[PDB]
Amino acid sequence: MDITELLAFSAKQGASDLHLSAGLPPMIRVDGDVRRINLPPLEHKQVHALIYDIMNDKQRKDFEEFLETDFSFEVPGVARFRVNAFNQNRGAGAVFRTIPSKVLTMEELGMGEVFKRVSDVPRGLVLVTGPTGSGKSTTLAAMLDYLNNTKYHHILTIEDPIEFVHESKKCLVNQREVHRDTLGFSEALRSALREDPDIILVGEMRDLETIRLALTAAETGHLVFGTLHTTSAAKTIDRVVDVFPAEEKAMVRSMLSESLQSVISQTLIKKIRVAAHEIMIGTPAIRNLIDKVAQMYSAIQTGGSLGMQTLDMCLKG
Amino acid sequence: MDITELLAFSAKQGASDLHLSAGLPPMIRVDGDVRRINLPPLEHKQVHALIYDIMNDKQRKDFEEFLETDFSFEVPGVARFRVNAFNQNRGAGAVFRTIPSKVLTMEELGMGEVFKRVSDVPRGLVLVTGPTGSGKSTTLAAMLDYLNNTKYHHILTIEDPIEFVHESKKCLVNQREVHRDTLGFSEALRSALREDPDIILVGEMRDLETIRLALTAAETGHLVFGTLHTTSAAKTIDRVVDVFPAEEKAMVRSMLSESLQSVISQTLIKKGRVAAHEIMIGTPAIRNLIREDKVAQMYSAIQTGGSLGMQTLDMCLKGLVALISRENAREKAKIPE
Amino acid sequence: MDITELLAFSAKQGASDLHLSAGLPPMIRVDGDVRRINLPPLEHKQVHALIYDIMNDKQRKDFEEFLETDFSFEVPGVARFRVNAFNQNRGAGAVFRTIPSKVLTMEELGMGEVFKRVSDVPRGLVLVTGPTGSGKSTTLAAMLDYLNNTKYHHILTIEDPIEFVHESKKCLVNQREVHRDTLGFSEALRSALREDPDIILVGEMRDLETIRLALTAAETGHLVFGTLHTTSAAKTIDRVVDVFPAEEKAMVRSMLSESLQSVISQTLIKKIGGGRVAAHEIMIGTPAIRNLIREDKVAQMYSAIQTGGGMQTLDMCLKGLSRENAREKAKIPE
Amino acid sequence: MDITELLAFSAKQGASDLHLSAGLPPMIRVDGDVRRINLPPLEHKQVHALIYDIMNDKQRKDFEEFLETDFSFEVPGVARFRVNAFNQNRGAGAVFRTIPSKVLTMEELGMGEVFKRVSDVPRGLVLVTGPTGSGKSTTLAAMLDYLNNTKYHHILTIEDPIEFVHESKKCLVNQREVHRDTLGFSEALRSALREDPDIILVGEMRDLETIRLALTAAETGHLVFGTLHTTSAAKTIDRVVDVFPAEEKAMVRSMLSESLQSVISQTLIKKGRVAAHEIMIGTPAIRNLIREDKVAQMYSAIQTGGSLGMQTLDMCLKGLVALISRENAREKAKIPE
Amino acid sequence: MDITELLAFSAKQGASDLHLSAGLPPMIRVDGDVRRINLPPLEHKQVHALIYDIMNDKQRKDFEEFLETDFSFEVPGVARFRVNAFNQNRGAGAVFRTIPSKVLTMEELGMGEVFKRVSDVPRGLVLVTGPTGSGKSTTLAAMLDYLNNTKYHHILTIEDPIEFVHESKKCLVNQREVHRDTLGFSEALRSALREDPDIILVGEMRDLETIRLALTAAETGHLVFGTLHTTSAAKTIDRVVDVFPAEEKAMVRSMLSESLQSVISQTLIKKIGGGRVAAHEIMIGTPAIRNLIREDKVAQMYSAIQTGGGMQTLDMCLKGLSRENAREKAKIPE
Amino acid sequence: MDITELLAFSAKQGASDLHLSAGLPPMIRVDGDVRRINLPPLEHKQVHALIYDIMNDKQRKDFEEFLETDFSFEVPGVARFRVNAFNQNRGAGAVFRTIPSKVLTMEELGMGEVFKRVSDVPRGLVLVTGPTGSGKSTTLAAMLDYLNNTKYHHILTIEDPIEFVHESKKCLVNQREVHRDTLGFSEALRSALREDPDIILVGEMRDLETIRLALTAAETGHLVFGTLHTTSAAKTIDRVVDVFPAEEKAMVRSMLSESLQSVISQTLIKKIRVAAHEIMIGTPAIRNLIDKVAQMYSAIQTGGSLGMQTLDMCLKG
Numbered sequence A, F: 001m002d003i004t005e006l007l008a009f010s011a012k013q014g015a016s017d018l019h020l021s022a023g024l025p026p027m028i029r030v031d032g033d034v035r036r037i038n039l040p041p042l043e044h045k046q047v048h049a050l051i052y053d054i055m056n057d058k059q060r061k062d063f064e065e066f067l068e069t070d071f072s073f074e075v076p077g078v079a080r081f082r083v084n085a086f087n088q089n090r091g092a093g094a095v096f097r098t099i100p101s102k103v104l105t106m107e108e109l110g111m112g113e114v115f116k117r118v119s120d121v122p123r124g125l126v127l128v129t130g131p132t133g134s135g136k137s138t139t140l141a142a143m144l145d146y147l148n149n150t151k152y153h154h155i156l157t158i159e160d161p162i163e164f165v166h167e168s169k170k171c172l173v174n175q176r177e178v179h180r181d182t183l184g185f186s187e188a189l190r191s192a193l194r195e196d197p198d199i200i201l202v203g204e205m206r207d208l209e210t211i212r213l214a215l216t217a218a219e220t221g222h223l224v225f226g227t228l229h230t231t232s233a234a235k236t237i238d239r240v241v242d243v244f245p246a247e248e249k250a251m252v253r254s255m256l257s258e259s260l261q262s263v264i265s266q267t268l269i270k271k272i273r274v275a276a277h278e279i280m281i282g283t284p285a286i287r288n289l290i291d292k293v294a295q296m297y298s299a300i301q302t303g304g305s306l307g308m309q310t311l312d313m314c315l316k317g
Numbered sequence B, D: 001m002d003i004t005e006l007l008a009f010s011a012k013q014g015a016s017d018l019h020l021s022a023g024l025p026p027m028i029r030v031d032g033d034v035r036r037i038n039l040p041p042l043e044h045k046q047v048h049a050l051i052y053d054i055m056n057d058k059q060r061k062d063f064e065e066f067l068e069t070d071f072s073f074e075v076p077g078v079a080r081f082r083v084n085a086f087n088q089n090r091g092a093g094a095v096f097r098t099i100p101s102k103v104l105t106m107e108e109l110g111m112g113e114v115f116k117r118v119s120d121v122p123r124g125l126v127l128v129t130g131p132t133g134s135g136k137s138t139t140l141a142a143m144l145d146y147l148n149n150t151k152y153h154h155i156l157t158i159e160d161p162i163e164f165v166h167e168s169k170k171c172l173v174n175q176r177e178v179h180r181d182t183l184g185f186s187e188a189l190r191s192a193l194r195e196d197p198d199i200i201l202v203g204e205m206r207d208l209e210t211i212r213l214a215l216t217a218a219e220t221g222h223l224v225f226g227t228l229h230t231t232s233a234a235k236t237i238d239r240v241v242d243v244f245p246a247e248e249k250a251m252v253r254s255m256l257s258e259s260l261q262s263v264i265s266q267t268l269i270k271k272g273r274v275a276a277h278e279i280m281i282g283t284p285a286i287r288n289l290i291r292e293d294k295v296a297q298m299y300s301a302i303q304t305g306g307s308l309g310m311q312t313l314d315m316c317l318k319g320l321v322a323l324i325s326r327e328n329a330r331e332k333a334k335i336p337e
Numbered sequence C, E: 001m002d003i004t005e006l007l008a009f010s011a012k013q014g015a016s017d018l019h020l021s022a023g024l025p026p027m028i029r030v031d032g033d034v035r036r037i038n039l040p041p042l043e044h045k046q047v048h049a050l051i052y053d054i055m056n057d058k059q060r061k062d063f064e065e066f067l068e069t070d071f072s073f074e075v076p077g078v079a080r081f082r083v084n085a086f087n088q089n090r091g092a093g094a095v096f097r098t099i100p101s102k103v104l105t106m107e108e109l110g111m112g113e114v115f116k117r118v119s120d121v122p123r124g125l126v127l128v129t130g131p132t133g134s135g136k137s138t139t140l141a142a143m144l145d146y147l148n149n150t151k152y153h154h155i156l157t158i159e160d161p162i163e164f165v166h167e168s169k170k171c172l173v174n175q176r177e178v179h180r181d182t183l184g185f186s187e188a189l190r191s192a193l194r195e196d197p198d199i200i201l202v203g204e205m206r207d208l209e210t211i212r213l214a215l216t217a218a219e220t221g222h223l224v225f226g227t228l229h230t231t232s233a234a235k236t237i238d239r240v241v242d243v244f245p246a247e248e249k250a251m252v253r254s255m256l257s258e259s260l261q262s263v264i265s266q267t268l269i270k271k272i273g274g275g276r277v278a279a280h281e282i283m284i285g286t287p288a289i290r291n292l293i294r295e296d297k298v299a300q301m302y303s304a305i306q307t308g309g310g311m312q313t314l315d316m317c318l319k320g321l322s323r324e325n326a327r328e329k330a331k332i333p334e
């Protein structure tokens, strides 16, 4: 009995995660809960076996050198998994996070015109944020899909790794997977500025160079999508400007305030699982606001007739 | 004659610590006093022997590289210990702190709903602080236990070394011992952000980046547990923000003010003894107090926070009239009277 | 069937770009749209073959070492292309951007006296801005050409990389391509200050360095053209001053306010019945506006331009020109 | 046919510049126009030949390393030139700026006592500024000449490349050409501080450290000469202080305010043509103006500084009614009227 | 005649230092004065010989590589010396500082109950300060000894390098020498917080790090002694708080004001009729003074001490004791 | 005819500097003036010869590598010279600055009790500053001499290079010449803190480490002398604090304000050549002043009865 059977089983169960922990049977997180599969506990040896069985030298070298490591792993028919191996008090430990295979519709998600409208801006920056778990990628996928269905454009994405896979419809879609198709977000980004892209998607925004660059893309005339694990328009902004050395905030705050087209912060809630969105749209007033970002909320609250909304506001809905 | 026999003997003696020091016989601390066991003095060779005999490569490598190291060590039937080896003028030296094996639950510790409520927050930051001796951990352990008993979640802790060992009950509990299971708090923390944890216990605030990281964990949607040596909500906050370079306080003070779910500062008093807790709970008002710098006016905030179940330490103290006494109480009050 | 035939075909089609993407037939961007050529999809092997067939060792070495690379490639009778090879989920990928071959004229673009007048200022700063797409380079080129045809001066350009290539007519034209002819904008700029230039072209101006220097060039008595991607005189200004550390804005705002000769922001629009035509916002240096700059009251710039009538609001220009089509590019729709 | 014949021919033509550009025949700038000489176009090979033929290793090494380089070059009977080699789209490129061989003295330039007085200060900073074309150097040269004729001092200059060449008269004159005699302004400057110089001419303000250093030279007790492209005392100051990181302006503004002995901003006007000077002299009042940030109120300071011999540029302009004209004058006035 | 005979002779003379300097006879510092021994001058060769004769390869290798080096050296019956070899204009040079052999008592130093009382606080911070010369170490040692003789506790010391060596009496005494037993004050300090120490001795406290940590030790419930070179309670405080970045003083001033148990500044004076006696300024923790600290009103500290009478002003202490001799060490002469 | 004869001749002439410059006869600066010796001009070859003749490989290697170099050079009976070689438009160039051989008396210099008093402080910092040329070293030498004559102490000096040489009188005097006896000011300084020194002299204060260290010496209980090329007590202070990163001024300003015992700024004037001193003495008031250093002057002006004096004040004298 090997890790594929297990992984396969996770998927068939709708599991978002598979957890291996020396000393316990495999468990899966489903609808947020983490629960044992009806199988015998896995002793250290076993889990460690299971793990090594799907790593290569490098990975095996790290894991042993640094006691923990990350890599992705694919189950051909089933799905791809993000995989983190680590050691704990009882022995080996690995968690598998299943990656959304299918890129779902906008209607399928019940998203409205507001989204299209945002997706339609000719250029500038759009940030779709949300606590790691709120399915950012999907909203994104859907918005991307929407353009791929309506514009004869060139969507260039940079993912670490690639999440959904899109089919080139009206758009040339080129997805580059960090570490396989490209050396990193910054390298890839630079190239992008000369790959004739219309729309650029940047998965993770780990280092400043990625931000820095991403901004120049928005500034030089493209439409760019990136994501932060901020949970609020206001926080999102702060987050972006605040990670820069004092001596450089101005230039960033300035840039952003000019290219920021909209910010969407998302989050999942248990359905009588449905997504709540805070929506903030670019607006001459808000532009300015971008050091008085404090007075952003009430701005969004009165932004209704453009389609904006407080998260709480959305909630009550 | 090996270190187990010794360790076992400590326990049988109710020793809180066993001390090995090249040049002296083993000694144990009991009821606070440190006293030689009726054995011959241990020469350097011996203690260093005794020590390596229970270490592994890594540990041996550190000790050798950094002249000192920590790790935990278990005596199967007897108890677990917290082991620090170091060198001193006379030769090798090692101190063993026995780790509480048996867990007290909130019940066993007489902790009330307030605690559960706190433990129950979906995400954010919770700091359980207190001097050493104060018993912060037990409280912690009890809180963690409480969720492990009631939620199907994933508790991930990052201790140095591991405090109490938990049995996965309703929770997947993964405890990682720094230096053995992981290279350090920061490395471990990062991984955590992608190990699908619900609750993260950060052992100590090993350094700025540990804080930095710990905060982003609270921010991105995990309940995070951490601890300080601060003895007051107010001080605890200050302590957190103040250890950052001026150029960066804002972003920290801002963060904290958003993710701080509650602060509990504890301390032991001679009953046995019994724990006094200052309890401060997250609250739109207090939030500001933090965001803004007006942390000064926090105290009266807590004093009127009664109905969320908050409490001044002193406030708590007076209660303990009901075990405790005044004499001592005065000795720990913030404002004796 | 090889990449030349394709490239050739792009040009014949007026394509601005040729795109190769393993898994899809070749596509070209024309009038801003990207569309498949009526050819069979190119499998990984093929595109990768096509690519390598035109690269040399170095290029092939990089591409393989760094998974992506750039280089230029020429089709003798047809045109030169700036070529980026990269890898994507489906296999190889390469995009060919055709480079303007002809250094093309001011009449041909229907630009008026206003432009000449601007081009004619003896010294100072001229910024031609606009975001990728609006081919200002084209207008710039035309303006430069204009002088190259009328003044016995020395035009010295610093481009990364050289866009249009000019032939020395009445002017000595020296174009330096960053990274080939020079180490960088700043290095090049300094030299320029002692290369006896009349007119200096600074390709892009995205950096404190380049800006700083560009300004001193304008200040020491030269005519300097620079460019941006801002879409508005007002924004352009803000953009320049705002990218400097607080402690230094004054000196920049001050400088600019003295050397700024004119700002032109451009943009392309779908010509009613095929094609596309450029709309220009034009703002000219003027004692009043100078202040507006030196002081911080750039806000009240708009109305200044509106009463500056050869100046013009972009919207103003628009109306001049498919209705809803444009009102779609207004700063105030209607 | 070699570069000398050409250079010689330039001079005979009154050319201010000779231009070599791979792909075109040699051209010269005369009366501001640039025009081809009646010779066949020069292919890359040729111009690159011509060039190396007059460079030495170092120069050749730079050109090769940094794709461009500067140096001076002399035609014995004819004149000295300022040589920059660079590459352009068509191939090699080089521009020769002829250096004024003959010196005009204050007399020949009609400069008055004000200048001598300034040149005579025992130590401190003197900035002679002006756009290119303005003739700042000549003035400079003349000032330097003046002391070289009257003091038994040691003038040390650090040009890139060397402007005018001086003959040691009453002064030991040591001119160091950056890239040939010295690695750079900063390296050279440091040495200067221990070469027993009285007067130091710094060519250009190559960079922050050049400024930094130049200032300490003024501060430690040397007369220092420097130049900017600024066209006004007020701007000159701003320019100096403003190019420093915020965190450091104070120390610069402070320094300057103490060592600034005088600022002269110059400019040429169509007579021939004739030079207009704005003159600003060090003065306890103005000092403050600098130390404090109130440089704004400098202008009126100069306007009442008449008796030390200070003068607004405009002020100076109107004088030139006596050659010059209004039409033009308006064109350079700070406030046309 | 070798360096042992000399060293031995120093000790017999009560010398604190032996100095070798090529070109001069050996000299010793006694009672603060440095004076030649009645011996012939030592030529370069000699001192250099004398030196090398007691060094080993490593030491000889450094000395030659880095022109100077340190190491310790012991005279079996007599004492250990901390030894620095260096080169000077005349040739070799070496200075021998004798290290206190005996961990010497509180009576022997005529220190009173005040000291015991201080030493007896269960936890908090105690600072014994004074500049090089005033051998506080001595008082410190005596205080530590006092507890080592009366409490069954664990004294853990962190010294660079270990000064007096204590024998474990009622206390477990662990002394760690920075650079030999530990990598640094901070590393060592951290470990300490989990070595079950009762009393912690931090040799010197000259660094944000060491201070920071030292404080947390006092804060988490320990008794920590640290030292300085300040010569006054008031100055001592200032000195601690003032070496921190503005943005962090509060937290430090706050901490200190809570853990500061007492400050002792010391100094030596020439005992009327030979020798020397120590004068101590004594300042004790006190609710009032606490505030004075937490608040910034440290100024009004003096009068606080003056009315704190076991506390004492230094001057106050002085009068207690050759007249003009002292009035020479007053904060207010007379 | 070689460079020794010349150098010798300089000394016999009271020259402060000998200048060699390809294209001109040798010249010497005397009483501030620089004048040709009655000798034929030195062609490039010659001066370059003369120079190489007294350099060694290293020096010759630098000079050629870096087009300029420094080193010292001694004329056995005569004096030691600081020597800077450089290249100029005409060829080689070298300047020789003669170093004060003799360390002169305090009386010989007509310096008063103020100086003794300063020299007598048991510890702390004393800065003798003055434009490179004002003979700082001498005032210093004299003060040092004064203690060497009156205290049984250990004077340790660190010079680059050694200027005057002192004879151990009542003091153990140990002079260490940077680059010969020690690797640098910082290395040497550190050692000093454990060489049982009473008084420490630090010639140059090039880098912060030297300052930093020098201060800790003053702070830990020694008397330290150092020099800056500042010309004023007020400037001197500023100079010291201002060269430190913002994040560290406090600690420096704080330290200094506690250890600063006195500042003396000097300068030479043409005698009907006599030294003018500005004298500033440590003082509870001034201590505080050390950010209000601005209000320092008037403090010194009223400091008379302690012995302080404005430079100008001194001048009129």
Ligand SMILES: [Cl-]
Pocket: B131, B132, B133, B134, B135, B136, B137
């Ligand atoms: Cl505890």
Ligand SMILES: [Cl-]
Pocket: C131, C132, C133, C134, C135, C136, C137
């Ligand atoms: Cl374009």
Ligand SMILES: [Cl-]
Pocket: D131, D132, D133, D134, D135, D136, D137
């Ligand atoms: Cl000029």
Ligand SMILES: [Cl-]
Pocket: E131, E132, E133, E134, E135, E136, E137
């Ligand atoms: Cl001592």
